[PDB]
């Protein structure tokens, strides 16, 4: 409905291709904190928090090291997913880039399960772009 979803694609950590994507679903949410800002006297758009689930496979053997380097630098890792949209005609686009993705609960062992198997994880995101316009 107001939920976006997609199937095949790729997951990236900066310039590194780190997994393939089987599917995703995402929803945008109005929070009370966003409601306060939009009501400020002194200004028709509103901030939003993105949340979803994504299913990953063919995880890179380099994920362990890439995450360790993020921790060393002090930077929580932020990803990009590219995926084939469901119902592309409704969007006027065939693919989506879901950006600034955070995985609050994915562990090193979860990444491990996704090398030879598949892993479904919740995620948050803050922006997106439509790709392959039609």
Numbering used by the authors: 7 to 49, 52 to 142
What does the paper say about this structure?
All R-type PTLBs consist of an inner needle-like rigid tube surrounded by a contractile sheath. Binding triggers extensive conformational changes in the baseplate, accompanied by contraction of the sheath, which, due to extensive interactions, drives the rigid inner tube into the cell envelope. Here, we have determined the crystal structures and SAXS envelopes of the R-type diffocin tube and sheath protein CD1364 and CD1363 in their pre-assembled monomeric state.
CD1364 possesses a compact fold with a central β-barrel flanked by two α-helices at both of its open sides. Whereas α-helices α2 and α4 cap the β-barrel on one side, the α-helices at the other protrude away from the β-barrel such that α1 covers the β-barrel of a symmetry-related neighbor. As was suspected from the molecular replacement process, CD1364 shares highest structural and sequence similarity with XkdM from B. subtilis as well as with gp104 from the bacteriophage φ812 tail tube, and the overall fold for these proteins is mainly preserved. Notably, in XkdM, α1 does not protrude away from the core of the structure such as in the crystal structure of CD1364 discussed here, but rather caps the β-barrel of the same molecule, again suggesting a high degree of flexibility for this region in both CD1364 and XkdM. Notably, in the tube protein CD1364, α1, which interacts with a neighboring molecule in the crystal structure, sticks out of the calculated envelope. Comparison reveals that the architecture of the central β-barrel mainly remains unaltered in the assembled tube whereas positions of α-helices α2, α3, and α4 are significantly changed.
